[PDB]
Design a protein around this nucleic acid. Structure first.
Lengths: 375, 375, 54
RNA sequence: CCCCCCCCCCCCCCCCCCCCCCCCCCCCCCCCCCCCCCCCCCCCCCCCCCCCCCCCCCCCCCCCCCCCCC
């Protein structure tokens, strides 16, 4: 009564503070940024395809080029708007298509290029040159190239943004460690696409995206909001359906510990009753309700580096963390997860009880009632 | 009390995120799209009929032509409006009827053709030429052609859009695998129509629609909203009544697993009481209530590739999925369904109990009460 | 309690969908339709009778 | 008539703080079956029957109020 009323709500107080700042910072991203408009979108898609048909393609620039497609889907105005909302000063760079004349192999030729701060009109033609090589070879092999094999396919842009989504998935750890996992999934999920494009090399493009995200960290914001706007969509090609699915696998990255908590509660893991865990409960509810209050935007807090994500940490509760992680251990869901319990005794006990849980399913008859049962 | 209050609502949080995007993408469909107005509708219907009376008709273009009828029913303005709502930039192409003069068999002739981006005025006259051949042959066989056999019949447009609806039915799987099922149904349901039209070849038209949907995936959106607008209708010919019926068989494609859940609950399948299934329940309700909240539009989420459809998956709950699928197995409703249980032990137990259920119907007397019963 | 609350309302959901279409189709009935006005009604009745006495 | 005593208040001690601690880390697209609907029979009605009827004005007496004290 007396003392049981004394508490301090720290998790929500902190949110309240960061939510109600009366002042703002603004960052100076760099000297330029290219904001391709809707009008350029088809050409960027075309350029994406050129990379995908090129066997053993050099994927150095593919990360950056993917970002460009995504921005050309958002549109010049929408893309700037999301940069400004994030708080960065923007030197917007208009993107026009111009023709370039250059003699390759002696003979003078025409090329379709973009005026880009980030991409030399030199390295652009080089992708189109390399693509043509892999294309005439492709034409020689099957006599006639099908529409699913060419750089025209409307899927090309979105196909590249698929392994981008997969990169976001594992971006929670912040390093390149997700890479092998990214490849693995790209191989099962995207196996059909990899059949139609010799240049769909997961390792390489995944590295190129990691590269662009690490280097230009504002793009990670841009991409997240693109993916949201792409998943808002009413319908779409199976590929866009794949993209959206993959993108959404990243919702709630960094907060795995949180879902394994709901699990521990769900399976009624005994070690949750332990006195020293019960002591933490008052606060562990505070954070779960904070997660609830935050709603949708919260899932991506860890992928973007949103300071407010620190607040969802269950790390601050060692006893609870330990039993939750032990539960997940005993149910065989963790590993090769690199989280450590701060309480070995609890972790072990939770794991032990969890392992025993899968052994006996007891039928509970009071969930559904029947007025006459012979059995 | 303490821990039982901790939960995270992920299904609804995710909807909330995709629903509340502050920015949007827009796609560049292609170079043109034909938007036939109400005024052209009768002519398109006529052209549809020409295909239906043509014995062994070439159905390559029939898919595309069907889409045109549907668009001419929606009307130029309504059709553009639905494209823009889906988010695609639209180069609208006005459709007018012009006369064309060409010498076939030496003799010069007149033809009624449409100005279409998608259809050469060459391949158009070829449908009318071929139709006339099958028509004079038809006139020779029965002496005089009845009105139900001609290309004039107001049903012709809608008849073609019937196998289109059937294609939508099986579009859930995304591949051509529904095709044999589509034929089967077209044969029982549409047998009367197939009698009046030698050119109503299900396999061929079904393939032509699959073709147009796979190729131009924005049409699948257009068609879905057409069907809705067609089913909104107050009255109509028996054929339109058939169309609507078939179209609505597709409501809830991809979510069969969901209905088989409601079934498992309805038959009170025992394996729902199992501890490891009870553990999932908290979340499996979350998704069913999300389905409820979504309402009508939800049924078509899988047919259009609406990202939000991923959210209705019961796949995320292996233990529940397995008993649900086993229940459906034991009641003999699944097969040749290609869904797999993730828990063989549960699937088998549910199947076993389900099989035993159909054997004994026990009369429950407490649903209806009577103040005096001699028996 | 737990599972007894899970249900899907399909019949009413479907009505809700067909009732709330944001777009409409329109059909082209044929080349003409005769729309006789009140003023012609007595003559049509007369013509009907001619069939009935025949 | 009312009224009538007493009586300011205050007076000590005392800054506050001080530890530890970023966080994160696994897996995983989804989907896949069947299936239009409908179908019987059937107009409705059909009896009797106005209502009402008696009696009957109301009223009637007595009586200002007030009056001390403070």
């Amino acid at each position: 009564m007396a003392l049981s009323k004394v508490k301090l709500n720290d998790t929500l107080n902190k949110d309240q503070l960061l939510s109600s700042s009366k002042y703002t910072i603004q960052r100076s991203t760099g000297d330029s940024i290219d904001t391709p408009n809707y009008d350029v979108q088809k050409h960027i898609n075309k350029l994406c395809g050129m990379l995908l048909i090129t066997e053993d393609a050099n994927h150095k620039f593919t990360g950056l080029i993917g970002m460009l497609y995504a921005m050309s889907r958002l549109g010049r105005e929408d893309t700037i708007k999301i940069l400004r909302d994030a708080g960065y000063h923007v030197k917007a760079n208009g993107v026009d298509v111009t023709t370039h004349r250059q003699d390759i192999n002696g003979k003078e030729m025409k090329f379709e290029v973009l005026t880009l701060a980030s991409l030399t009109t030199e390295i652009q033609i080089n992708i189109e040159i390399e693509s043509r090589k892999s294309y005439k070879k492709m034409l020689k092999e099957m006599g006639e190239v099908a529409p699913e094999y060419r750089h025209d396919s409307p899927d090309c842009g979105m196909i590249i943004l698929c392994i981008a989504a997969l990169v976001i998935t594992k971006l929670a750890a912040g390093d390149r460690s997700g890479l092998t996992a990214v490849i693995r999934r790209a191989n099962n999920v995207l196996k059909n696409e990899m059949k139609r494009y010799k240049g769909l090399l997961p390792k390489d493009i995944a590295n190129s995206f990691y590269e662009v995200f690490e280097k230009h960290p504002h793009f990670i914001d841009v991409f997240v909001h693109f993916g949201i706007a792409q998943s808002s969509t009413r319908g779409g090609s199976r590929v866009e359906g794949i993209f959206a699915g993959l993108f959404m696998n990243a919702y709630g990255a960094g907060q795995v510990m949180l879902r394994w908590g709901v699990l521990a509660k769900s399976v009624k893991n005994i070690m949750l009753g332990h006195a020293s865990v019960q002591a933490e409960m008052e606060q562990v509810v505070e954070v779960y309700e904070y997660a609830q209050k935050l709603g949708g935007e919260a899932g991506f807090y860890h992928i973007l580096n949103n300071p407010k994500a620190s607040l969802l940490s269950l790390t601050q509760f060692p006893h609870f963390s330990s039993v939750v992680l032990g539960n997940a251990a005993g149910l065989g869901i963790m590993g090769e997860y690199r989280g450590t319990p701060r309480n070995q005794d609890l972790y072990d006990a939770a794991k032990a009880y969890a392992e025993q849980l899968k052994e006996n399913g007891v039928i509970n008859y009071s969930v559904l009632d029947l007025t006459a049962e012979e059995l």
